[PDB]
Design a protein around this ligand. Structure first.
Ligand SMILES: CN(C)C(=O)N1CCOC[C@@]12CCOC2
Length: 185
């Protein structure tokens, strides 16, 4: 792909984070803490899952960023509507305002309803995310495998401003403590 030139500098929005997340001082890395991180509750925080949004809002144009997923067992990545539900249980689906892929139990899947099996030969250490607002497109690229396509959501109905979306996953196993990191441009 030739999307690299639409690179945007993404930072994480503390105020949206689940109360167990630890966001680095530079707002470029996030990991699951082993306890509540001593923050007040607010209506923005994701309550049920280890999720956080980027601070940036996109309503037009072409945007590209990269995320490091090294050594993680489980995570979700993509974009979502600014108006997504924060409290209680929900599925990741375009009907609920999410355009995502994930790793879970040694398989990669796209967040369609129902979910779609992904075909990845080289487990990725870094993921590239491309959004074309006007075209209604969200695409995912395997940076570890020369930028090979993972998945394209097309005919997307964004229906509002979009925010970068992250889930570091639970760490019940003791094997998923590693952070998500926004990679330098
Ligand atoms: C750490 N853990 C397994 C949790 O139970 N947490 C803590 C972080 O917020 C989400 C919830 C899941 C169920 O609601 C609370």
């Amino acid at each position: 792909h030739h999307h690299h030139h639409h690179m945007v500098h993404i930072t994480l929005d503390r105020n949206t984070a689940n109360s167990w997340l630890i966001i680095s001082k530079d707002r470029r890395q996030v990991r699951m803490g082993d306890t509540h991180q001593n923050v007040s509750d607010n209506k923005e925080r994701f309550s049920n899952y280890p999720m956080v949004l980027g601070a940036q809002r996109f309503s037009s144009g072409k945007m590209y960023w990269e995320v490091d997923v090294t050594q993680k067992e489980a995570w979700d990545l993509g974009v979502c509507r600014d108006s997504v539900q924060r409290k209680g249980q929900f599925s990741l689906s375009p009907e609920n305002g999410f355009w995502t892929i994930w790793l879970w139990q040694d398989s990669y899947e796209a967040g369609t309803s129902p979910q779609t099996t992904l075909h990845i030969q080289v487990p990725p250490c870094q993921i590239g995310i491309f959004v074309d607002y006007e075209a209604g497109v969200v695409s995912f690229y395997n940076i570890t495998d020369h930028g090979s396509l993972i998945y394209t959501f097309s005919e997307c109905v964004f229906a509002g401003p979009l925010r970068p979306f992250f889930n570091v996953g639970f760490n019940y196993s003791g094997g998923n403590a590693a952070p998500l990191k926004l990679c330098p441009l």
